[PDB]
Paper text:
The first step of the incorporation pathway involves the activation of sialic acid to a cytidine monophosphate diester form catalyzed by [name]-sialic acid synthetase (EC 2.7.7.43), a ubiquitous enzyme that is found in both prokaryotes and eukaryotes. In the presence of [name]+, [name]-sialic acid synthetase (CMAS) catalyzes a sequential ordered reaction that involves a nucleophilic attack on the α-phosphate of CTP by the anomeric O atom of β-Neu5Ac and the production of [name]-sialic acid and pyrophosphate (PPi). The activated sialic acid is then incorporated into LOS or LPS by sialyltransferases. In this report, we present crystal structures of the apo form of the VcCMAS enzyme and of that complexed with cytidine diphos­phate ([name]) and [name]+.
The orthorhombic crystals (space group P212121) of the [name]-bound enzyme contain four molecules in the asymmetric unit arranged as dimer of dimers (AB and CD). The final refined [name]-bound VcCMAS model contains protein residues 3–228 in subunits A and D, 0–233 in subunit B and 1–227 in subunit C plus three [name] molecules, one [name]+ ion, one Ca2+ ion and one tetraethylene glycol (PG4), one triethylene glycol (PGE) and two ethylene glycol (EDO) molecules. The P-loop residues 13–20 are disordered in subunit D, which lacks [name] in the active site. The nucleotide-binding residues in subunit C and the bound [name] molecule ([name] 1) have well ordered electron density with low temperature factors and thus were used in structural analyses. Hydrogen-bond interactions between the conserved Arg71 guanidium Nη1 and Nη2 atoms and the N3 and O5 atoms of the cytosine base impart selectivity of the enzyme towards CTP. Several conserved residues in the P loop such as Arg12, Gly14, Ser15, Lys16 and Lys21 interact with the α- and β-phosphoryl groups of the nucleotide. c electron density indicative of a metal ion close to the α-phosphate of [name] and the putative [name]+-binding residues Asp213 and Asp215 (analogous to Asp209 and Asp211 in NmCMAS) in protomer C. Along with the [name]+ ion at this site, several water molecules interacting with the phosphoryl group of the nucleotide and the metal ion were also identified. Since the [name]+ ion interacts with both the protein and the α-phosphoryl group of [name] and is situated adjacent to the catalytic 2′-OH group of the modeled Neu5Ac, we designate this [name]+ ion as the catalytic ion that is responsible for activating the hydroxyl group of Neu5Ac. Upon [name] binding, the VcCMAS structure shows conformational changes in the dimerization domain, which lead to partial closure of the active site and place the catalytic Arg169 near the Neu5Ac binding pocket. As a consequence, the [name]-bound VcCMAS monomers have a larger dimer interface (1699 Å2) compared with the apo structure (1429 Å2).
Author numbering:
A (entry chain B): 0 to 233
B (entry chain A): 3 to 163, 173 to 228
């Protein structure tokens, strides 16, 4: 169908495998998660923004900004909790609590603050243009994996893709992509058919390595702060 | 075994302007590679293949010999094979000395030292290799990436999910005679010279150059 509706889902847990409270850390005057909430809200194609959280501060920040809160069960906020299970829970919550029927879900990670409304807009346009079942934001690494080698038992090496691939121009080879975790745009119906992410009609939404920045440490956060400060003062 | 170093440096670039001649810790970028080739005992002569006046002036000034590269071989479309074949042809006409191996070195790898070149040539001799290429093991293994299919879709490169190496572009040590009979890089008896990710730094932007400057102070 030509006319489709989209819902944004932001998954942010309180706990972490590190000694960092990532999702609420200040970045250029606002909590980290705020950059992703605002990117979703700023996009014309997004009807509603939902934040799935178990945390009081994340929920408070989210509601304050105008996003809707999906109260996530304890089991789904553990270090062992599966990405699929959180999505299925959010799909279930939406089907029971939200009257609007959505074709696609735009899953967005709070750890990708350089992914903007413009990136979401473009990813949804690609999703529609290609008749995709799943659009994932990716980047082309500086050292492309299509030009890599694998080690043989005798200690020699051979091209992973082909024998001539490591010596060929990157432009003359199929492109190899690395997902950056910023955007996962998928058909809600196709996700709950296999109860997992679609395996077919998967298209890449290409972003630069610079815009692919993922927050894991205070250094990652410091680097992005400087980048935003540099764009501010020029 | 006698070895000739070939440094391929074109004037043009898709990104960073005058890349090969930009200052890095007191020396033009290319000078780090010229000096790393000259500092290695196994290297008899150092040649710089360029289409550029500035690169040639810097190279001659550092004592390297200049191979004047034709315009078509300095384009964005120009093949790696064609640049090497041209240098092989130039060497066979303009050089009385016969070399068994060619050590192809990129000026964009300034953290690759004489020590790294010595070790790659030692591996080349010890293994009786047809080809030795400097590599690194990336933090994100290439086997876990996606490959773009013909219809525009993506799927896992290797499978839907082994030791992987990524060439860093710093050193290519191969037999000249063997390269001439194949008109391509050897496909067998290829051994990896493993370097760290940190020493595998490649200059493409002013940020890459600034990062190397900082880890050079
Ligand atoms: N079961 C989980 C795991 C991570 N996440 C969130 O997904 C983002 C990226 O996860 P991450 O790689 O930083 O992992 P942790 O910080 O949770 O150790 C973070 O913003 C998490 O808050 C979640 O919502 N539910
Ligand atoms: N057709 C070409 C392309 C690159 N090169 C050189 O190969 C090195 C690395 O090239 P590169 O991958 O960064 O691409 P460009 O700088 O040419 O855009 C540089 O020192 C280039 O000057 C060359 O000699 N002939
Ligand atoms: Ca873009």
């Amino acid at each position: 169908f030509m006319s489709n509706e989209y819902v944004a889902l932001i998954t942010a847990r309180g706990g972490s495998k590190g000694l960092l409270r990532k999702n609420v850390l200040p970045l250029h005057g606002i909590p980290l998660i705020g950059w992703t909430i605002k990117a979703a809200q700023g996009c014309s194609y997004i009807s509603k923004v939902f934040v799935s959280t178990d945390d009081y501060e994340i929920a408070k920040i989210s509601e304050g900004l105008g996003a809707l809160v999906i109260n996530r069960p304890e089991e789904l906020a553990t270090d062992t909790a599966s990405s699929i299970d959180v999505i299925l829970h959010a799909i279930s919550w939406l089907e029971q609590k939200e009257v609007q029927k959505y074709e696609g879900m735009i899953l967005l990670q709070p750890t990708s603050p350089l992914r903007t409304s413009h990136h979401i807009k473009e990813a949804i346009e690609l999703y529609e243009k290609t008749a995709a079942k799943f659009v994932i934001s990716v980047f082309e690494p500086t050292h492309t994996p299509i030009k890599s080698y694998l080690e043989n038992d005798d200690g020699t090496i051979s091209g992973l893709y082909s024998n001539e691939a490591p010596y060929q121009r990157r432009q003359d080879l199929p492109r190899a992509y690395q997902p950056n975790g910023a955007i996962y745009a998928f058909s809600i119906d196709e996700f709950k058919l296999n109860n997992h992410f679609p395996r077919n009609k998967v298209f890449p939404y290409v972003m630069s390595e610079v815009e692919s920045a993922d927050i894991d440490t205070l250094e990652d956060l410091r680097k992005v702060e400087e980048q935003l400060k540099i764009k501010e003062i020029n």
